[PDB]
């Protein structure tokens, strides 16, 4: 659990990369779509305008997919899925699925408390 093996997580451009003219029209969602226009001002990359995605913004290979604790997430659904992370514990962390029954949340957590596994959503349907 203690997880002291990762170096200084850094994130280039922690914003969300909204589409253009999502702020103006409601049909135009915020999911990113590239402007293929010809008289545009984003495909042309003007000043004061928004920033398109690139590979330069790519995160470091040693700090990709890592939650800020330093663990990376594994989506689980039962105990059979946990028991693979019995050994890969200081690197991986369990996220219980959204379709799981409360009767079966607690048994999973009870097994994780034993195996020393770190769960990211233990307050789900505490009941």
């Amino acid at each position: 659990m203690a997880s002291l093996p990762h170096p200084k997580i850094v994130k280039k451009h922690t914003k969300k990369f909204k589409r253009h003219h999502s702020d103006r029209y409601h049909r135009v969602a915020e999911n990113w779509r590239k402007q293929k226009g010809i008289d545009s001002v984003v495909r042309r990359r003007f000043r004061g305008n928004i920033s398109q995605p690139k590979i330069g913004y790519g995160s470091n290979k040693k700090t990709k997919f890592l939650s800020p604790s330093g663990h990376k997430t594994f989506l689980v659904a039962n105990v059979k899925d946990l028991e693979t992370l019995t050994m890969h514990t200081k690197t991986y962390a369990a996220e219980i699925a959204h379709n799981i029954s409360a009767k079966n949340r607690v048994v999973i957590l009870a097994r994780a408390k034993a195996l020393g596994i770190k769960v990211t959503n233990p307050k789900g349907r505490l009941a």
């Binding site: 594994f74 989506l75 689980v76 659904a77 899925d81 693979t84 050994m87 890969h88 699925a97």
Partner: peptide, 10 residues
């Protein structure tokens, strides 16, 4: 089986 493991779990 809500997610596939990496190939060898380094």
């Amino acid at each position: 089986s809500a997610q596939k493991a990496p190939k060898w779990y380094p």
